Design a binder for this molecule. Structure first.
Ligand SMILES: O=C(O)c1cccc(C(=O)O)n1
Ligand SMILES: O=C(O)c1cccc(C(=O)O)n1
Ligand SMILES: [Zn+2]
Ligand SMILES: [Zn+2]
Lengths: 332, 332
């Protein structure tokens, strides 16, 4: 009921990305009937979205009703475009980052921005992060759980973290690009399961890959309660102890030690799950996050947190605000 | 401390399945240390296994040091062989179910068998089910979190469940056949992550399969605390509310209403994880299990459970032996 770290927005419209770059596979936004807009990935309507997804005044209005002071705006993860030619992805990012900056400058007390980067091109990414921080004044950027074949361990992605740490730029890691075919192609599994597992895979890839060790000041936040992690860190930190040959290759420390090193959002729905998340990550490293305006998100922002009979005043207002404030590097 | 529901065992030697069935790609055991072996996937070896893995007498001694009263024996998962020709798998299942009977006869109050079956052939596997219960005395069977493409919801499998529901034969569902290549070929992730995900997938498949609903009397138990399920059940439950088009076409009851319908083992390594599990799955429904004799298992059987400072010594008993008996329908 204060700060929302996990929300997604889209320009009302953008150019024919196919026309613009010369090849296909991009997404376009069709406004056909009123109130609704169809997202197209060449051919299929892959998701239908309402006005709140592109129109800030509509968002301020829903925010006002739900008591939410500020949303951190990031793009829809499908816009990452990590696959395309680096200079084309970078062109998109500058356009989505500019649109993001336009929305913030208009309600700077209601929004802050989390940019996207052309991650497949680490040098291009690091340039947009400078521009995003010095020019646009973004506190941080939102990034995928993996860049094609690279997981958040690849040393190639090291120029980006070194940048983020120097630029005091936060990192919100979002699962995306799950497997969508075959056995996941049913029961919404790509989303109920495939997603938390991408986040588990990334949290693992980072710790064991040494990143938190190499950049002890790189501030990270993972989506969806950290995925399965808070419950399976026990298994994970044990397999680590049992096979240093498979696991301790790049970073000797036990995963159990980076607990308290990173944040997650509190999007876990159940109160028993929230208790554990704070139990295991710290009442200081958990951040309210809604997946606004998507349905798989928390419909009543902060409700789960102000129901916790376990939590007192300073802890609820931490999970609801101060943690966000701390992670972004802003202040009341 | 009492009953261990999760232990794997192998014959000391088995024939040449390649020069016995017509094709390679099978598994076979090789010795080279008067008490050490290596398992071959037609060429190279992927697991090095001590003597405790095949010799019953060796297992009793260790059981005895550790306070372990009875072990439930099953075949190492990689032995399932769902990919082979139906017969060339049913054959191997008889060989292994028999070398399982054999061992329980040798120690009828220290062992019980959970037989394996030729799952990619519902009817064959239905009969081999009949055997194990009526002739071999098996109280259940171990099976994989999936079968080729078949997920535990496929209607091809419904005859197997009906049969199990008659024969009063419990199912221990065990992960396996995780992704090895691509992005998982590092940090052991296939075991640290793909395994816990494969279980989560099988529990979902079964709930939204309506398997539990068409078979109220099927006693099923999952490996490793149900994977991610206990933590992510909220997410799945809320997802099922929001998208009944993708989620509820096969069974309409929200997954949250099955909390209490299946067991899991207790292999979660952490007291915070164990405590969440009994709160989500239930005290009546969590069964101690060790994964003996594998390194990712609990080295000191029953220990986490006996530390659980928040369980009365009666509750610790349900977890050690109480729940295992009820599930297998066995006599204290
Ligand atoms: O674009 C997506 O796939 C996405 C991203 C964040 C949340 C959600 C959701 O949970 O609905 N979906
Ligand atoms: O045979 C397997 O693949 C297997 C089965 C259960 C546990 C383990 C393990 O986690 O060590 N490995
Ligand atoms: Zn999101
Ligand atoms: Zn096992």
């Amino acid at each position: 009921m204060k700060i929302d770290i996990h929300s997604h927005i889209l320009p009302k419209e953008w150019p024919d990305l196919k026309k613009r770059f010369g090849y296909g596979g991009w997404v376009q936004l069709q406004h056909h009937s009123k109130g609704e807009a169809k997202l197209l990935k060449d051919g299929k309507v892959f998701r239908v979205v309402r006005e709140n997804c592109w129109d800030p005044e509509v968002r301020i209005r829903e925010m006002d009703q739900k008591g939410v002071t500020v949303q951190a705006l990031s793009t829809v993860p499908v816009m990452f475009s990590y696959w395309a030619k680096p200079e084309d992805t970078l062109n998109l990012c500058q356009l989505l980052n500019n649109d993001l900056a336009s929305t913030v400058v208009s309600y700077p007390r209601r929004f802050v921005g989390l940019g996207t980067l052309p991650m497949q091109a680490p040098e291009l990414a690091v340039k947009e992060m400078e521009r995003c921080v010095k020019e646009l004044g973004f506190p941080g950027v939102q990034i995928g759980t993996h860049v094609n074949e690279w997981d958040l361990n690849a040393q190639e992605l090291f120029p980006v973290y070194a940048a983020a740490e120097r630029l005091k730029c936060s990192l919100f890691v979002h699962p995306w690009d799950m497997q969508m075919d075959g056995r996941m192609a049913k029961y919404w599994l790509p989303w109920l399961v495939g997603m938390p597992a991408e986040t588990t895979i990334a949290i693992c890839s980072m710790i064991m890959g040494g990143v938190f060790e190499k950049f002890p000041k790189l501030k990270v936040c993972f989506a969806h309660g950290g995925g399965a992690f808070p419950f399976t860190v026990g298994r994970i930190s044990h397999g680590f102890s049992m096979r240093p040959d498979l696991c301790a290759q790049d970073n000797p420390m036990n995963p159990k030690k980076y607990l308290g090193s990173f944040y997650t959002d509190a999007l876990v729905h159940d109160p028993l799950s929230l208790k554990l998340l704070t139990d295991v990550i710290g009442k200081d490293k958990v951040i309210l996050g809604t997946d606004y305006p998507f349905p798989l998100g928390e419909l009543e922002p902060g409700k789960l947190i102000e129901s916790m009979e376990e939590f007192d005043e300073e802890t609820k207002n931490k999970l609801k605000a101060g943690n966000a404030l701390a992670f972004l590097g802003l202040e009341r």
